[PDB]
DNA sequence: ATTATGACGCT
DNA sequence: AGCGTCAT
């Protein structure tokens with residue numbers, strides 16, 4: 503009872519940009535704004551592959567992973583923007599720079615954890631304590647939460663979406679105890695006020711809209727963020743978890759969408775996250791390992807301890823290109839030329855990183871895939887990265903992979919390569 | 933012939 | 944160190 507810690511110590515937010523690459527292209531080209539729009543890489547094969555979709559286009563069924571030609575079948579008026587091509591490959595520099603814009607704004611409010619190109623976690627615990635001190639017990643006005651949904655409300659005792667949102671927010675605010683500076687629900691609420699301010703700053707200063715989740719940990723904040731996209735934020739309280747999880751398919755929780763989640767479902771004969779509560783911690787550890795079992799036991803009760811890492815910058819800088827079907831690399835000249843192209847992009851990105859961020863990578867990872875292997879990587883080899891020189895990096899990558907070529911002929915490469923990947927890692931302050 | 937990444941766990 | 948998983 504009283505000693506049963508409830509995972510309510512922290513306030514954590516997850517901010518995720520809406521259809522990010524689409525918004526970057528819509529800012530640049532006003533003709534794409536408020537239209538069914540998608541971003542594609544390449545063009546020749548099936549119109550190119552879609553990686554981002556505006557919410558207008560999603561209404562027609564357009565999705566990530568779809569070929570543009572098929573998307574045009576669903577939505578003939580779909581507008582398309584192509585990712586830049588440099589040195590023969592997709593070049594994502596424009597979106598990385600737009601990402602830095604957003605991350606720098608977020609960092610004004612709190613130390614952030616960059617989780618991807620378009621989303622970051624925020625530990626708002628301390629900022630919430632400060633704003634609570636300033637409030638002096640003043641209640642929180644619904645006017646300060648103009649885009650916030652409270653998950654699970656309204657309940658009990660109404661036709662429009664905004665009306666439902668305000669109804670739920672009113673129920674939430676009317677139930678709040680604002681004389682208690684340690685009430686977790688009050689803390690989440692103040693956290694949501696701060697996130698409204700953060701999202702307002704992002705849109706004012708970049709033109710980009712985002713959604714957000716506010717809860718007591720990273721997994722619940724990420725799930726919350728998804729509930730009311732786009733351009734809205736959602737508060738998931740500790741108390742909302744039993745109802746939320748009672749119908750939540752296990753695969754919706756981050757990290758359970760793959761083989762482990764499928765094993766949970768098959769071994770335990772369950773479907774929803776809430777069903778996990780009936781097992782003991784030892785039972786779950788016995789099926790899924792000590793770490794996974796402890797994580798599942800806590801997570802199905804809304805409890806998770808993974809910290810928001812103080813990390814605004816990526817830990818690695820990498821360059822990769824697939825060579826599918828008949829484009830697979832089958833000569834030594836080909837393999838060398840593409841290693842050079844990747845290494846030249848890598849050198850450019852690394853040199854800009856060193857100038858911006860006062861650090862130097864010290865290890866080069868070379869990964870390849872060979873024809874007939876379904877795995878992502880067929881082989882990974884590291885070597886030393888001592889100079890930011892593309893010619894040296896590509897020569898070193900060739901040296902570490904060249905023993906892969908089973909061809910007796912010096913010129914031919916067999917079996918052909920379906921992927922090259924260069925990744926700079928193990929950064930040190932310079 | 934989804935593709936270009938990036939994070940992290942395991943042994 | 945090299946490989947596998949998860950993500951998207």
Ligand SMILES: Nc1nc2c(ncn2[C@H]2C[C@H](O)[C@@H](COP(=O)(O)NP(=O)(O)OP(=O)(O)O)O2)c(=O)[nH]1
Pocket residue numbers: 518519520521522523524553554555566619620731732935936951
């Ligand atoms: N190159 C590449 N980029 C990708 C891929 N998948 C996503 N991206 C890029 C393009 C995406 O714009 C960006 C962020 O990924 P999300 O947050 O998962 N999707 P979004 O922000 O579009 O929509 P939502 O409003 O639902 O969050 O990552 C991929 O497979 N490859």
Ligand SMILES: [Mn+2]
Pocket residue numbers: 518519520521522620
């Ligand atoms: Mn996004």
Ligand SMILES: [Mn+2]
Pocket residue numbers: 518519618620621
């Ligand atoms: Mn994202």
